Amino acid sequence: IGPKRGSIVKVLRRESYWFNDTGKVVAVDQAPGVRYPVVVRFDKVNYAGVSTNNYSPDELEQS
Amino acid sequence: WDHVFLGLFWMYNAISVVIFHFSWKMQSDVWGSISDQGVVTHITGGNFAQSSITINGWLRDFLWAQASQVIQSYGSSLSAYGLLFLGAHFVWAFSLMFLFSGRGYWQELIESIVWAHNKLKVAPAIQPRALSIVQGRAVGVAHYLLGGIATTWAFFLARIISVG
Amino acid sequence: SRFPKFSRGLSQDPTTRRIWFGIATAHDFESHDDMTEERLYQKIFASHFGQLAIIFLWTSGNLFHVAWQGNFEAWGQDPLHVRPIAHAIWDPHFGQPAVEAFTRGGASGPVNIAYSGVYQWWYTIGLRTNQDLYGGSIFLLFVSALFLIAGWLHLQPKWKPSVSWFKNAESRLNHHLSGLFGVSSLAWTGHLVHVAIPESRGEHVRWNNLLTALPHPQGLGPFFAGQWNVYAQNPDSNSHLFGTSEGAGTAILTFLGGFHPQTQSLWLTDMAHHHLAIAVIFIIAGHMYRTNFGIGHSMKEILEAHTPPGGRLGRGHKGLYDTINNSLHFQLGLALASLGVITSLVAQHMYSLPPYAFLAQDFTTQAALYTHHQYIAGFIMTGAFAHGAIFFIRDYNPEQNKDNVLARMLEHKEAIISHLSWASLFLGFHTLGLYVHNDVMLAFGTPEKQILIEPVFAQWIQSAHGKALYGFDVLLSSADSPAFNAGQTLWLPGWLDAINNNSNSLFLTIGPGDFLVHHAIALGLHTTTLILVKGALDARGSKLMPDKKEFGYSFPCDGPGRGGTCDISAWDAFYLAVFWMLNTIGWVTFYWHWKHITLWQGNVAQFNESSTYLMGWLRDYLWLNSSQLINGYNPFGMNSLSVWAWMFLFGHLVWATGFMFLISWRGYWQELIETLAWAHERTPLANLVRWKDKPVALSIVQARLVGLAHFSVGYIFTYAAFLIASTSGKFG
Amino acid sequence: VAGLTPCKESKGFAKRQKQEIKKLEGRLKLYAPDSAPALAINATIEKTKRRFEFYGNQGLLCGTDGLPHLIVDGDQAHLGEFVYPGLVFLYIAGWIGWVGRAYLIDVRTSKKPTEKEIIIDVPLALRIMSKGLTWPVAAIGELRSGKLVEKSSNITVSPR
Amino acid sequence: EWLPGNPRPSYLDGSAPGDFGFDPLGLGEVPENLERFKESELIHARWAMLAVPGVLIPEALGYGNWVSAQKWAATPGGQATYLGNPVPWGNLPVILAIEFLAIAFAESQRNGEPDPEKRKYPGGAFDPLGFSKGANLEELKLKEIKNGRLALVAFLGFAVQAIAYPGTGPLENLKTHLADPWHNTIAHVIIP
Amino acid sequence: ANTALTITLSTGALLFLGRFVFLPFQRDNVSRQGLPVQNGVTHFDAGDSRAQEVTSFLKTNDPAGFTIVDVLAWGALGHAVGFFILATINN
Numbered sequence A: 001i002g003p004k005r006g007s008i009v010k011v012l013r014r015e016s017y018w019f020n021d022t023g024k025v026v027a028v029d030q031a032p033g034v035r036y037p038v039v040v041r042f043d044k045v046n047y048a049g050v051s052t053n054n055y056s057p058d059e060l061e062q063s
Numbered sequence B: 001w002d003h004v005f006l007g008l009f010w011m012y013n014a015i016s017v018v019i020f021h022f023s024w025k026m027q028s029d030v031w032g033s034i035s036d037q038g039v040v041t042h043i044t045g046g047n048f049a050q051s052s053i054t055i056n057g058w059l060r061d062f063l064w065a066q067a068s069q070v071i072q073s074y075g076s077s078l079s080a081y082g083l084l085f086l087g088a089h090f091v092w093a094f095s096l097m098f099l100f101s102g103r104g105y106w107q108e109l110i111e112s113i114v115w116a117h118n119k120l121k122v123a124p125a126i127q128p129r130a131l132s133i134v135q136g137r138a139v140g141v142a143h144y145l146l147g148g149i150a151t152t153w154a155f156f157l158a159r160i161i162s163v164g
Numbered sequence C: 001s002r003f004p005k006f007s008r009g010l011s012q013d014p015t016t017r018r019i020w021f022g023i024a025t026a027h028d029f030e031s032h033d034d035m036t037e038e039r040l041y042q043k044i045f046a047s048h049f050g051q052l053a054i055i056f057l058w059t060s061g062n063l064f065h066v067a068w069q070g071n072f073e074a075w076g077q078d079p080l081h082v083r084p085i086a087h088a089i090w091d092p093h094f095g096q097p098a099v100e101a102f103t104r105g106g107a108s109g110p111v112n113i114a115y116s117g118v119y120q121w122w123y124t125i126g127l128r129t130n131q132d133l134y135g136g137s138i139f140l141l142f143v144s145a146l147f148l149i150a151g152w153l154h155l156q157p158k159w160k161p162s163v164s165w166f167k168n169a170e171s172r173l174n175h176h177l178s179g180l181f182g183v184s185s186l187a188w189t190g191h192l193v194h195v196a197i198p199e200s201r202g203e204h205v206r207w208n209n210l211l212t213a214l215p216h217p218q219g220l221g222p223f224f225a226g227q228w229n230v231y232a233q234n235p236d237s238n239s240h241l242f243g244t245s246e247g248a249g250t251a252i253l254t255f256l257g258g259f260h261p262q263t264q265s266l267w268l269t270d271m272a273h274h275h276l277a278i279a280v281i282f283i284i285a286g287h288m289y290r291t292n293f294g295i296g297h298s299m300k301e302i303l304e305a306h307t308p309p310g311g312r313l314g315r316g317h318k319g320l321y322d323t324i325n326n327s328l329h330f331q332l333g334l335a336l337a338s339l340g341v342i343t344s345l346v347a348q349h350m351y352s353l354p355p356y357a358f359l360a361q362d363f364t365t366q367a368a369l370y371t372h373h374q375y376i377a378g379f380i381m382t383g384a385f386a387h388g389a390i391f392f393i394r395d396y397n398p399e400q401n402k403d404n405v406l407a408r409m410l411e412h413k414e415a416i417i418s419h420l421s422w423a424s425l426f427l428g429f430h431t432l433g434l435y436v437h438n439d440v441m442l443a444f445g446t447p448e449k450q451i452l453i454e455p456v457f458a459q460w461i462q463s464a465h466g467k468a469l470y471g472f473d474v475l476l477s478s479a480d481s482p483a484f485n486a487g488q489t490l491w492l493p494g495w496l497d498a499i500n501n502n503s504n505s506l507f508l509t510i511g512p513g514d515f516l517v518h519h520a521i522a523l524g525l526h527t528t529t530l531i532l533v534k535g536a537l538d539a540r541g542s543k544l545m546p547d548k549k550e551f552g553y554s555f556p557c558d559g560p561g562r563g564g565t566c567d568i569s570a571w572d573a574f575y576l577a578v579f580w581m582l583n584t585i586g587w588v589t590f591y592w593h594w595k596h597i598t599l600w601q602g603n604v605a606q607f608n609e610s611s612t613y614l615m616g617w618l619r620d621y622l623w624l625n626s627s628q629l630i631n632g633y634n635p636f637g638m639n640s641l642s643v644w645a646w647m648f649l650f651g652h653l654v655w656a657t658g659f660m661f662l663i664s665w666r667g668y669w670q671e672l673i674e675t676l677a678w679a680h681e682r683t684p685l686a687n688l689v690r691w692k693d694k695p696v697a698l699s700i701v702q703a704r705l706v707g708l709a710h711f712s713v714g715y716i717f718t719y720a721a722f723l724i725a726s727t728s729g730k731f732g
Numbered sequence D: 001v002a003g004l005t006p007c008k009e010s011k012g013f014a015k016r017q018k019q020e021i022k023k024l025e026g027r028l029k030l031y032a033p034d035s036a037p038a039l040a041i042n043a044t045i046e047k048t049k050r051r052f053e054f055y056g057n058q059g060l061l062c063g064t065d066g067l068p069h070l071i072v073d074g075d076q077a078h079l080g081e082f083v084y085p086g087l088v089f090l091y092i093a094g095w096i097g098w099v100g101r102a103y104l105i106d107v108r109t110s111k112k113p114t115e116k117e118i119i120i121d122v123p124l125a126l127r128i129m130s131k132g133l134t135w136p137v138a139a140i141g142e143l144r145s146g147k148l149v150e151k152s153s154n155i156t157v158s159p160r
Numbered sequence E: 001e002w003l004p005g006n007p008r009p010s011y012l013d014g015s016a017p018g019d020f021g022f023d024p025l026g027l028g029e030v031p032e033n034l035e036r037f038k039e040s041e042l043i044h045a046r047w048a049m050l051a052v053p054g055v056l057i058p059e060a061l062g063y064g065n066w067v068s069a070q071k072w073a074a075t076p077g078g079q080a081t082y083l084g085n086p087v088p089w090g091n092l093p094v095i096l097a098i099e100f101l102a103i104a105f106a107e108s109q110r111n112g113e114p115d116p117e118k119r120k121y122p123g124g125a126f127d128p129l130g131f132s133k134g135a136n137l138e139e140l141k142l143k144e145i146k147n148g149r150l151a152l153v154a155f156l157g158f159a160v161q162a163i164a165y166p167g168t169g170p171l172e173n174l175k176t177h178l179a180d181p182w183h184n185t186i187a188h189v190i191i192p
Numbered sequence F: 001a002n003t004a005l006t007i008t009l010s011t012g013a014l015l016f017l018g019r020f021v022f023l024p025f026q027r028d029n030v031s032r033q034g035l036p037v038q039n040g041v042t043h044f045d046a047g048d049s050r051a052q053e054v055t056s057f058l059k060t061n062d063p064a065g066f067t068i069v070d071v072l073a074w075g076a077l078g079h080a081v082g083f084f085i086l087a088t089i090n091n
């Protein structure tokens, strides 16, 4: 599943720090039952200092 | 650290009343002039024994009567003491911005400013953040000590130069 | 079920916080447990009745103290040389100098001089003797008793009104505009015409001779025959003395404009016509909405139909009628926004156009009456904005407000906050840089090197009003404008004589210092609006914390994680903007009191040379006017300003005490109270005494509130003292 | 204009010139006429007399305080008080705003974009600080081409 | 075709009479707004073409301009001189109450048409000479809005000449312009 | 002057406008806006007994639906205009 590994996606999740921000997909989990399989890496950190977050494919579009 | 931060204010309070007692005590009972036949006229003659027992005397015969040379020093050589007296009040009231406020308000205000920067493509890659809570308290106590100490420095160095 | 009984979650608190928060969550009725719509609106309705009863029981005691311990008749004989007495003082702590020094106004004992302008008001309105004020006090005791009876009555289940009666906005607006604003201003007009105008003309009109004392020589004949100009036929002349029959006229509704030449105050015939005009227009405006009779408006379809078809406002105002009608915080925020803008319109129009006889001559009373309505208006406007924030947390539904104007405020909220931030930063760098520059040039011996900007826009508006001082000569100062020729036979002979006078406060001569402090005022309003719009629009959430709505309105923080989330809530933005309204209204009333304290003793050049730089503000206003303030009591003796000298120092206590809650924060005091609890639990003879409430430190929201309230009490008492001691001890 | 006399014919402005030299002349009375501190007060007097003869020759408006007031409405007589040095300022302030905006675009397309803001690339900086000379033609040029503003779909927006 | 080579917008195809594509600000972009703008452009123009003979022909016959023949109502006594003859019923409450009755009955009957084309050009009783039921129909509607926009520009001229030069009328502005036309233009208003 | 003719003609002019001119404009707007509506229901439908629209007072015998409330509304404007005229004339 997922759009593609190594692709550029835009986050549609409202409560994330990287909403409407360009991110790079580093891992998509193909195991069933995982709610947020797509792991997206960002060039900028959030207030917690991390750049790695998991999103569903419904919360991302290819840009 | 926050106890050091509050003890810095209590050092301001302690040392400021120490130097206030010093300045009034020796301007009233020590410093002055001697005329003929052994008569001693002090700067503020004998008012420490009667006015320094009330806060109204401290505000009136010390903080108002002796501040009548730091505020009308303008247009003279001691006018930089008036400028730093007022700018020291500025740094003190600037301290009250950092001391009374907290990080999350300033972080969301910076988020609005970052939105205005994103609109005009002038977003820095180094993300603008509000100062930390330890850092906000440090900045507030640094401006509080700097502004209040510079206020007392300007008032002292205008008054006792003017009457000395 | 302990105290507080309205919240079950605070009753199981074993600490002192249960005692504290139950005081502070006492009137937040919608946050209570087992709480419904009907109980909300009925408790709010009876709380309104209790508020009305408190206001009328306040006015009754402010009338009873003037009638009982005040010299209202002696002030009526000579309002220029008699100080108005508020109430007598019975203090067991006075020595003989304090009894001998507070005895003013020809009283038999120590009394308080009234700086509330109640004597000027009651004189202008028609009250003359102490018996009339006593009868008014008994009447308003009866009115407050009736409002207590009505408040108890509507909590009884026979007379409980339903929420559909409460949310009936059309009937409420029709009976408010028709009845509250129309029949009360027409009632007023009936007073001003029947009582106040003949008491200004010497005739004693009371209830015993109400039906016999005709207010006009031909009363109610020319009214119903159409010739209303008979009521403007013979106005009061310029030789008219107030309260005496000599020099007086017979016209009850004039349109003279300007001031009465002896009192420097507005004409009672003009205020009677003013009220007949804001009575006809409010009864006519109260027949607007649809209640019961087929005609009228539905405001839901007005708001639905007011959508711009280009889509620039989205859906327009669709869904806003249910948004206001379901949210009590929206209605309260709108009411407080309008109330702040009219309590400030009150303040701006009772100093420049004094409405009460001998109020312009009494200087410290006018100063108190401006500072009163500018502080009450800077707390009412901040309450409006805070209630907008509480609406956005606990009352705003994004599903019901779908792409309307209110949702589009949240859509572009970062643009509003960033542009208020730009405007505040612009005003701050420019006002501070120009004041600091003028300070440097007065410091460096060169007053001519100041950047002094003549406020030519507001001077052009003053010349548009009729001021011939600046010589712009555009309209109402030039005779070639159609507005002047339409006004020069109607109201302008009074207005131009009032505005071309230089002793009054009607549209004062402004200068570069006025420009600079008006940008200080714009800085204050813009930065207070910045913090408050930021609190209201980041109320539901933000990029730091998106779930601020699910944490309530007044939550403390969200923890040290994600950088740090101190003061993240919308209540904390209200908290930070109470300091900004205090600074704003401090600047406003500093400008008012120094522009007037130099006008009243004549030397306006002191303000014109010294207000452009902050050392003039510190030295010629804060230091110079405080000469007889802090000398209210000395080692040598005490004066009559001594209570104002203590209240000044008292303010410097309480304000600075607020710093103890605003700088030092909770866990220091929590460990301190932990050591104190150990010390009490181990001390012999004192361990026997227990606490039931566990001693804890003040909680974080409570700490910010207590420091804010101390800051506000000290701020209002330092300035109430200085302002009522630097004008009432040096009159002029 | 606005009830203000010109400073060349203002009696209060000439009074401030008289009482400023007299303050400095009395400071000169306690020094030797060829001494080094007396040359500073003599240079102060000539700086004061140059200042008062410059303020009166520019058509400045002086009030009842004897002080030069600025008319910022946009008067044809008063352009150099606010309009002329305001356009001089906004050109310089827009120069600061254009070379700081163009530096951030030039370092956002880099390997480590955050190390180029603590350590500012001076050959990259100085090659666009020259380019900030013609910035109204480049700001409205980017505004007309759409490169000045960013579309709201690519802008980080806090949730409602 | 208000600018040769300019792309006409999609909501202005040219089939309307006077559709020259002049909408730079896009006010008629909304379809239901554009149907009101077409019946607003014509009532305005027809009132303007009833106004240009109502201004010049009273001025050319010597009974003053459209301003000095209008100031009598502000005067308590003006007596309402019409063609040099004061009408007996020419009082300000009399002629305004008729105008708030007769025109309001005319405009309410005008707004009652449900058809969006009979609102534009009604015909029937309002066309007794039968030119609407003739060979030429499209060019007369183009004649309506070309004459109408000329009188609409004329009344804008009429109004701002009175603001710029009070006490003078449009033929008196024409007589002032016809004497020395290279000195007394709109530049006297632009440059004071 | 002439109170008995100015008031009567001005009330009769506004009642002529209310009956024959603006009555399709008023009857369309009281149906398009309708009764006031809170949360999707009428105030009387939500439980307010005092918000019931009266029908015995609105029971008109006029063929165009011109009721006594419209008499009390359009005739009130005719007296507001009529006393605007009388105050302007008597000056």
Ligand code: CLA
Pocket (backbone or CB within 6 Å): C044, C045, C048, C049, C052, C165, C166, C168, C169, C171, C172, C175, C176, C178, C179, C180, C181, C184
């Ligand atoms: C004609 C009928 C009538 C009238 C007189 C009123 C009267 C009132 N209603 Mg009411 N109402 C009515 C019918 C009526 N209503 C109807 C039919 C509805 C049904 C939907 C309601 C439902 C309703 C609700 C649910 C509430 C009210 C409330 C109130 C009170 C408003 C608050 C107050 O006293 O401020 C007084 C305000 C004014 C006098 C207006 C002053 C305007 C500005 C602010 C001041 C200008 C005055 C002037 C400048 C100041 C000079 C004075 C100075 C010298 C001292 C007031 C007593 C509230 C209340 O307090 O309940 C007890 C309340 O809860 N009513």
Ligand SMILES: CC1=C(/C=C/C(C)=C/C=C/C(C)=C/C=C/C=C(C)/C=C/C=C(C)/C=C/C2=C(C)CCCC2(C)C)C(C)(C)CCC1
Pocket (backbone or CB within 6 Å): C329, C330, C332, C333, C334, C337, C338, C341, C381, C384, C385, C387, C388, C389, C391, C536
């Ligand atoms: C957040 C929110 C809120 C709030 C807000 C606020 C609080 C606001 C404010 C605002 C304001 C508070 C405003 C005010 C305004 C006002 C105005 C805007 C005024 C104006 C005026 C005018 C325009 C007039 C005119 C004139 C003049 C000027 C002169 C001459 C005369 C005349 C009359 C003509 C609420 C609650 C809703 C809820 C939701 C949210």
Ligand SMILES: CC1=C(/C=C/C(C)=C/C=C/C(C)=C/C=C/C=C(C)/C=C/C=C(C)/C=C/C2=C(C)CCCC2(C)C)C(C)(C)CCC1
Pocket (backbone or CB within 6 Å): C280, F011, F015, F071, F072, F073, F074, F075, F076, F079, F080, F081, F083
């Ligand atoms: C034709 C006809 C008929 C008859 C009818 C009639 C005869 C009617 C009349 C009507 C009328 C007879 C009406 C009236 C009305 C009135 C009113 C409704 C009034 C009101 C008033 C007002 C409300 C006013 C106000 C005011 C005042 C009080 C004072 C101040 C000022 C003013 C002016 C505002 C019939 C049915 C047989 C049928 C057939 C046809």
Ligand SMILES: CC1=C(C/C=C(\C)CCC[C@H](C)CCC[C@H](C)CCCC(C)C)C(=O)c2ccccc2C1=O
Pocket (backbone or CB within 6 Å): B097, B098, B099, B101, B102, B103, B106, B107, B129, B130, B131, B132, B133, B135, B136, B137
């Ligand atoms: C104002 C404030 C901030 C915001 C403070 C900030 C963002 C510091 C601003 C530092 C300077 C002005 C910005 C960086 C300047 C750069 C060196 C760029 C130079 C631009 C000019 C200065 C030349 C907090 O973060 C805070 C945190 C906790 C309690 C109170 C507060 C608080 O009061």
Ligand code: SF4
Pocket (backbone or CB within 6 Å): B102, B133, C556, C557, C558, C559, C560, C564, C565, C566, C567, C665, C700
């Ligand atoms: S408890 Fe205090 S210091 Fe800790 S995060 Fe909350 S507000 Fe900040």
